[PDB]
Design a protein around this ligand. Structure first.
Ligand SMILES: [Mg+2]
Ligand SMILES: [Mg+2]
Ligand SMILES: [Mg+2]
Ligand SMILES: [Mg+2]
Ligand SMILES: [Mg+2]
Ligand SMILES: [Mg+2]
Ligand SMILES: [Mg+2]
Ligand SMILES: [Mg+2]
Ligand SMILES: [Mg+2]
Ligand SMILES: [Mg+2]
Ligand SMILES: [Mg+2]
Ligand SMILES: [Mg+2]
Ligand SMILES: [Mg+2]
Ligand SMILES: [Mg+2]
Ligand SMILES: [Mg+2]
Ligand SMILES: [Mg+2]
Ligand SMILES: [Mg+2]
Ligand SMILES: [Mg+2]
Ligand SMILES: [Mg+2]
Ligand SMILES: [Mg+2]
Ligand SMILES: [Mg+2]
Ligand SMILES: [Mg+2]
Ligand SMILES: [Mg+2]
Ligand SMILES: [Mg+2]
Ligand SMILES: [Mg+2]
Ligand SMILES: [Mg+2]
Ligand SMILES: [Mg+2]
Ligand SMILES: [Mg+2]
Ligand SMILES: [Mg+2]
Ligand SMILES: [Mg+2]
Ligand SMILES: [Mg+2]
Ligand SMILES: [Mg+2]
Ligand SMILES: [Mg+2]
Ligand SMILES: [Mg+2]
Ligand SMILES: [Mg+2]
Ligand SMILES: [Mg+2]
Ligand SMILES: [Mg+2]
Ligand SMILES: [Mg+2]
Ligand SMILES: [Mg+2]
Ligand SMILES: [Mg+2]
Ligand SMILES: [Mg+2]
Ligand SMILES: [Mg+2]
Ligand SMILES: [Mg+2]
Ligand SMILES: [Mg+2]
Ligand SMILES: [Mg+2]
Ligand SMILES: [Mg+2]
Ligand SMILES: [Mg+2]
Ligand SMILES: [Mg+2]
Ligand SMILES: [Mg+2]
Ligand SMILES: [Mg+2]
Ligand SMILES: [Mg+2]
Ligand SMILES: [Mg+2]
Ligand SMILES: [Mg+2]
Ligand SMILES: [Mg+2]
Ligand SMILES: [Mg+2]
Ligand SMILES: [Mg+2]
Ligand SMILES: [Mg+2]
Ligand SMILES: [Mg+2]
Ligand SMILES: [Mg+2]
Ligand SMILES: [Mg+2]
Ligand SMILES: [Mg+2]
Ligand SMILES: [Mg+2]
Ligand SMILES: [Mg+2]
Ligand SMILES: [Mg+2]
Ligand SMILES: [Mg+2]
Ligand SMILES: [Mg+2]
Ligand SMILES: [Mg+2]
Ligand SMILES: [Mg+2]
Ligand SMILES: [Mg+2]
Ligand SMILES: [Mg+2]
Ligand SMILES: [Mg+2]
Ligand SMILES: [Mg+2]
Ligand SMILES: [Mg+2]
Ligand SMILES: [Mg+2]
Ligand SMILES: [Mg+2]
Ligand SMILES: [Mg+2]
Ligand SMILES: [Mg+2]
Ligand SMILES: [Mg+2]
Ligand SMILES: [Mg+2]
Ligand SMILES: [Mg+2]
Lengths: 123, 119, 209, 114, 56
RNA sequence: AGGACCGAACCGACUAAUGUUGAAAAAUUAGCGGAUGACUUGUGGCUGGGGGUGAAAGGCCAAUCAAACCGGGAGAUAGCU
RNA sequence: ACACAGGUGGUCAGGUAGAGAAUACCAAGGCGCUUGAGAGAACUCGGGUGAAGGAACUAGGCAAAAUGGUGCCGUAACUUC
RNA sequence: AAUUCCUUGUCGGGUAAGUUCCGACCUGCACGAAUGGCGUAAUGAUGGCCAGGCUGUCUCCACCCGAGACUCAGUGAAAU
RNA sequence: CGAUGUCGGCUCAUCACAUCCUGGGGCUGAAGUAGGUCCCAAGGGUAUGGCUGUUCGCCAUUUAAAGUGGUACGCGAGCUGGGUUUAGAACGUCGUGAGACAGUUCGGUCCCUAUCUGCCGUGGGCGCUGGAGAACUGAGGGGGGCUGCUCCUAGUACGAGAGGACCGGAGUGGACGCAUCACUGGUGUUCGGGUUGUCAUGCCAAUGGCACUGCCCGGUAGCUAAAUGCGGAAGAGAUAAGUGCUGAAAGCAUCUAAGCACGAAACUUGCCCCGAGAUGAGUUCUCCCUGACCCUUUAAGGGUCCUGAAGGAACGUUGAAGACGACGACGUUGAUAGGCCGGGUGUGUAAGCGCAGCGAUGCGUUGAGCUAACCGGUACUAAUGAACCGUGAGGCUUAACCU
């Protein structure tokens, strides 16, 4: 359940540690963004020498929420934090090369095959 | 809304209701019949009749429980020495509500609540 | 096609083999027994009038018991009436089981909703509350404005205001029927139907398909 | 009700082992990726148990790849396959929600020897 | 929040049309003492459904 | 030592809510400032209306002040309603 | 103006904890505030808790929430030291 | 600028975006030297801006506890 | 002018169409995609933020689209009071001055218990022509109507390529709405436990009172949303713009004059809800009452005695029904409520005793004890025998049938 002004941790080696969601894409008056959802973000904190720079505006895909995701048995998978992987604005492919922490089965598609390829654990 | 709930608020807070039903249960055990309002009598059945079912098994623990509920050793003694074996065969329903009209000060519907094995 | 009169037993879930939990609403459907067949020559329309359940003999009235005695059937707890399609007929003392829904796939369930009592416009009509701070004087959940200035000295009909909420007939459409257990008179529909537990339900086959 | 209980007892699983909160459990669930059912393992500490018969559930917390992961299994679901008590623990609560801010040495629980 | 014309005694009577009291329909009679009481209430002497439930 | 510090009594009155035919013709509740000093308080006294007093707001002078109140000139005058 | 949640100077100063005349619970002593009884709608008042997010509210972080003690370590620009 | 109309002046910083803020420029409509000029540590229930923490402020409200509101009995107003 | 509160925001809205999106078309200097322009069309929908008192505007990022206006520039007896526009103070400027400036700057009391109309709900009365209990029809009224993206068709048509479809089908979403509590959660001052201070129960132990429920930790039912089910339609009819067919007037031509066909999210239906006070008061089914007499002003007349039906109402136990009424269940031939038994759930191994330890404490008895609203049972208590209301065959006139 990610909205605007929500801070997120960064799950890749793109160079950011802490980003802020500025827009939940895909629909008018759209309140929230779960996992697998694309969010336009800005960067609030970065490493000194990264691919990205503090104040850049780009997209990101949410991969972990503290609210969690439900499975068709009724089960739910919660995380302790909110994490996103940065994307390009246009090509919408991931920028980093090494994914940190687990991801979920809702992520897998033709679109995020790279992320499920690089994740150390897929729940 | 009040769906499937229980317990009357009686325009009192929770500690006042608990101390009022503790006093009224002790007065009913003491005199075996009292005259109070019909709502207080109906909510008192849910206090007194568990004390008698507790009093059917005279243990030290149950004496301590009845003391934590009543805070009167005279009431706990009358419960386990008299009303226990008096009601040892009744499957609940140890008391009786008798509506007795209307209070002169506020037109409140009054009732006599008494124990069954009194007379 | 006609429907049947059941009763909301409660909700549960059906675990499939595939790991899917289907939230179902158990609807017991006893033998609906017909009490009257209405037709065009006497009544102007084609329908049946059914009854279900049982009733206390000291409480069923002489008009009602004579109405069941003419059909020659046990008194049930009510009387409902279902319009007939063409080429469809039933006898008077006929019993109708839940095997009628044996090969349907979606139903529409009509029930009487829960009584919310006198409800405000936040709950009833989903109005926004006003500001809980920033100066608000006694106006946190009020409906705000209700009209305009002098042009129609009057509030319009159907203005959304507070009042009785619930306790009324609603129909949920296109519910997937999961299981039809004729032996213990059940009907498991996917999802949540209106009504409280133990209330009467009208299950008809889905008209929108 | 009796009808509900009859519908639920025919769906329950007869082999659910006895586990308490604070027990380190290992749950083997079914994973359908592509078309091949495999059996993924999940192992952590039971922080909560909710007993509702068929609707019974339990919560497992583990620290995976630095991140803390809670997962609420439905007990009588067929998508779980095995439940194994690896290490039983000694706590004096029913629900260990305080472990969500304890890490490392602070989040230890002693062994419930019997 | 206040009127602009004086309401009539006709409107006053029509508003008081529903303020009438309902008299008690019938007093139940005790079977032993033969005195009248409210149905489901004890008598004044302390009888109810025959027995003397309380002295006085 | 201190027109020093924190903070009750005490003095004051910054903010919000209530109340606004009030509990109250200015208050209550929760917070707030000073609190050994140019402090505060009791009792008694003095200054009188174009006058007093005023760390000065035209503030206060008995719920009344860009000139108090009471009585009188006085039935002022009113091309106004 | 009231049997009015206001105002009113001095004196006495028990116990446990506590720096304390704060605060909590009590003693001596004195009260339960001169309409009650029910019910447990909207709405208002005064409070309690809240998923995920955390000022995006708003004129404005108003109000709430939060901080809060003792001891020790340690403590910047600037400075009238 | 507590002074600048034109003006949201221009440039820079800060922000994803800043008519406000800070630093500069000077083209000072219409600053300016005891109706004081420019600085200034400390102080301020002072004005403007920013950040951390915090949170029902809000997204979007939900439930609960009490006093009213509602019903009964008694007394019994008011503006108009 | 013996008072019509004047910006902006909030909350509710509602209408117009000169239509922003979606829908249907015509022309194109329309290859396709994407556009330009005009016509028809108002069913639904129609951003969040930064700055600023702002409306506006600029900017950031969205979206199918971020419509234009009316409504006392809608809405202060609905909120706010930042701006404007009171009294205090200051700057610049003007004036000798008091003072002044659509110049700026800091601060600065927003009342009303709703009589009527109106509206949202909910009842009482009477009526509908004997009374009563039910089930209906449906005159009419209201609700609802949004849309993206992907895939297939098909890299097909088109095109030199680049690119890239119509039509048609399937899936998955966003916003909104209805319902529900099985799941995930919230609350759960009526459940369990821990703990601080103090007081008390003679004391120990164990408990209880107060301290915001003392502070906390969990949590039943219930209510809930953030949770999960469903919906928007398809179809038909008549059409708008428009497209035509045949065909003259006007030997041709011509969509029109006669005649016929197609045609849109608009219209009427189809879907949902109310609904016979629809006084035009409807329909069906069932039940109940089949006594004597007096009267004068003899008539839809008045009265006496006997009779008291079907049913209802009242009372009581009450409810996932409810402001009160109302509605629903039940009243001994009884599970309506409480209690009780058993179970479940929650909390988390009670007290007492024994052992170990100097002791705090730990261990055994012990997953113990307690356990609200839950589930299945059970007449133990309370739901009284009655009494009350309601009557006694139900107008006239024709018509037709049967005697
Ligand atoms: Mg109950
Ligand atoms: Mg009261
Ligand atoms: Mg208390
Ligand atoms: Mg209800
Ligand atoms: Mg709002
Ligand atoms: Mg006010
Ligand atoms: Mg308020
Ligand atoms: Mg008019
Ligand atoms: Mg007038
Ligand atoms: Mg009245
Ligand atoms: Mg000092
Ligand atoms: Mg104060
Ligand atoms: Mg001080
Ligand atoms: Mg002045
Ligand atoms: Mg004065
Ligand atoms: Mg004078
Ligand atoms: Mg003068
Ligand atoms: Mg003279
Ligand atoms: Mg005169
Ligand atoms: Mg008094
Ligand atoms: Mg006083
Ligand atoms: Mg003391
Ligand atoms: Mg309340
Ligand atoms: Mg709080
Ligand atoms: Mg709680
Ligand atoms: Mg929260
Ligand atoms: Mg909690
Ligand atoms: Mg949280
Ligand atoms: Mg803002
Ligand atoms: Mg805003
Ligand atoms: Mg504040
Ligand atoms: Mg606070
Ligand atoms: Mg100047
Ligand atoms: Mg300017
Ligand atoms: Mg700039
Ligand atoms: Mg700002
Ligand atoms: Mg500057
Ligand atoms: Mg100067
Ligand atoms: Mg000079
Ligand atoms: Mg100076
Ligand atoms: Mg009264
Ligand atoms: Mg008067
Ligand atoms: Mg005027
Ligand atoms: Mg006037
Ligand atoms: Mg066109
Ligand atoms: Mg047009
Ligand atoms: Mg429109
Ligand atoms: Mg239509
Ligand atoms: Mg804007
Ligand atoms: Mg900001
Ligand atoms: Mg309008
Ligand atoms: Mg205009
Ligand atoms: Mg206006
Ligand atoms: Mg108005
Ligand atoms: Mg206004
Ligand atoms: Mg008005
Ligand atoms: Mg102002
Ligand atoms: Mg001034
Ligand atoms: Mg002016
Ligand atoms: Mg009527
Ligand atoms: Mg209609
Ligand atoms: Mg739930
Ligand atoms: Mg929970
Ligand atoms: Mg719950
Ligand atoms: Mg204590
Ligand atoms: Mg002790
Ligand atoms: Mg005490
Ligand atoms: Mg059509
Ligand atoms: Mg045409
Ligand atoms: Mg032609
Ligand atoms: Mg021709
Ligand atoms: Mg056609
Ligand atoms: Mg559509
Ligand atoms: Mg029983
Ligand atoms: Mg204990
Ligand atoms: Mg033990
Ligand atoms: Mg053990
Ligand atoms: Mg247990
Ligand atoms: Mg039990
Ligand atoms: Mg039960």
């Amino acid at each position: 359940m990610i909205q605007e002004q929500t801070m997120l941790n960064v799950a890749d080696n793109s160079g950011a540690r802490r980003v802020m969601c500025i827009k939940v894409l895909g629909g008018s008056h759209r309140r929230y963004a779960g996992v697998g959802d694309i969010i336009k973000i800005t960067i609030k904190e970065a490493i000194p020498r990264g691919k990205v720079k503090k104040g850049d505006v780009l997209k990101a895909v949410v991969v972990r929420t503290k609210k969690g995701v439900r499975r068709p048995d009724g089960s739910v998978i919660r995380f302790d934090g909110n994490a996103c992987v940065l994307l390009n604005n246009n090509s919408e492919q991931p920028i980093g090369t090494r994914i940190f922490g687990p991801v979920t089965r809702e992520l897998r598609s033709e679109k995020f095959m790279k992320i499920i390829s690089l994740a150390p654990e897929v729940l | 809304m009040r769906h499937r709930k229980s317990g009357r608020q009686l325009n009192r807070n929770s500690s006042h209701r608990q101390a009022m039903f503790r006093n009224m249960a002790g007065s009913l055990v003491r005199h075996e019949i009292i005259k109070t309002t019909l709502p207080k009598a109906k909510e008192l059945r849910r206090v007194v009749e568990p004390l008698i079912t507790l009093a059917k098994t005279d243990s030290v623990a149950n004496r301590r429980l009845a003391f934590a509920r009543t805070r009167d050793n005279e009431i706990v003694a009358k419960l386990f020495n008299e009303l226990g074996p008096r009601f040892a065969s009744r499957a609940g329903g140890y008391t009786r509500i008798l509506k007795c009209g209307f209070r002169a000060g506020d037109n409140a519907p009054m009732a006599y609540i008494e124990l069954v094995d009194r007379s | 096609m006609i429907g049947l009169v059941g009763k909301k037993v409660g909700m549960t879930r059906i675990f499939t083999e595939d790991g899917v939990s289907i939230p179902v609403t158990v609807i017991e459907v006893e033998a609906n027994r017909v009490t009257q067949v209405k037709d065009l020559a006497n009544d102007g329309y084609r329908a049946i009038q059914v009854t279900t359940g049982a009733k206390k003999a000291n409480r069923v009235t002489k008009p009602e018991a004579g109405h069941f005695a003419k059909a020659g059937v046990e008194a049930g707890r009510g009387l409902w009436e279902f319009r007939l399609a063409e080429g469809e007929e039933f006898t008077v003392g006929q019993s109708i089981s839940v095997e009628l829904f044996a090969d349907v796939k979606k139903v529409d369930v009509t029930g009487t909703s829960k009584g919310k009592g006198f409800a405000g416009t936040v709950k009833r009509w989903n109005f926004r509350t006003q500001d809980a701070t920033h100066g608000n004087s006694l106006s946190h959940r009020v409906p705000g404005s209700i009209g305009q200035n002098q042009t129609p000295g009057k509030v319009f009909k159907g203005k959304k205001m507070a009042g009785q909420m619930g306790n009324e007939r609603v129909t949920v459409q296109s519910l997937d029927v999961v299981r039809v257990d004729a032996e213990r008179n059940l009907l498991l529909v996917k999802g949540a139907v209106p009504g409280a537990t133990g209330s009467d339900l009208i299950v008809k086959p889905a008209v929108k398909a | 009700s009796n009808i509900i209980k009859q519908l639920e007892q025919e769906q329950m699983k007869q082999d659910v082992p006895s586990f308490r909160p604070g027990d380190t459990v290992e749950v083997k669930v079914w994973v359908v990726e592509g078309s091949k059912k495999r059996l993924q393992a999940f192992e952590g500490v039971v922080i909560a148990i909710r007993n509702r018969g068929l609707h019974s559930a339990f919560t497992v917390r583990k620290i995976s790849n630095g991140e803390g992961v809670e997962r609420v299994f439905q007990t009588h679901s067929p998508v779980v396959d095995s439940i194994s008590v690896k290490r039983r623990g000694a706590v004096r609560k029913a629900k260990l929600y305080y472990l969500r801010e304890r890490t490392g040495k602070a989040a230890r629980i002693k062994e419930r020897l019997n | 929040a206040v009127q602009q014309n004086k309401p009539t005694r006709s409107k006053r009577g029509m508003r008081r049309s529903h303020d009438a009291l309902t008299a008690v329909t019938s007093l139940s009679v005790d079977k032993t003492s033969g005195e009248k009481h409210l149905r489901h209430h004890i008598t004044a002497d302390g009888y109810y459904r025959g027995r003397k439930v309380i002295a006085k």
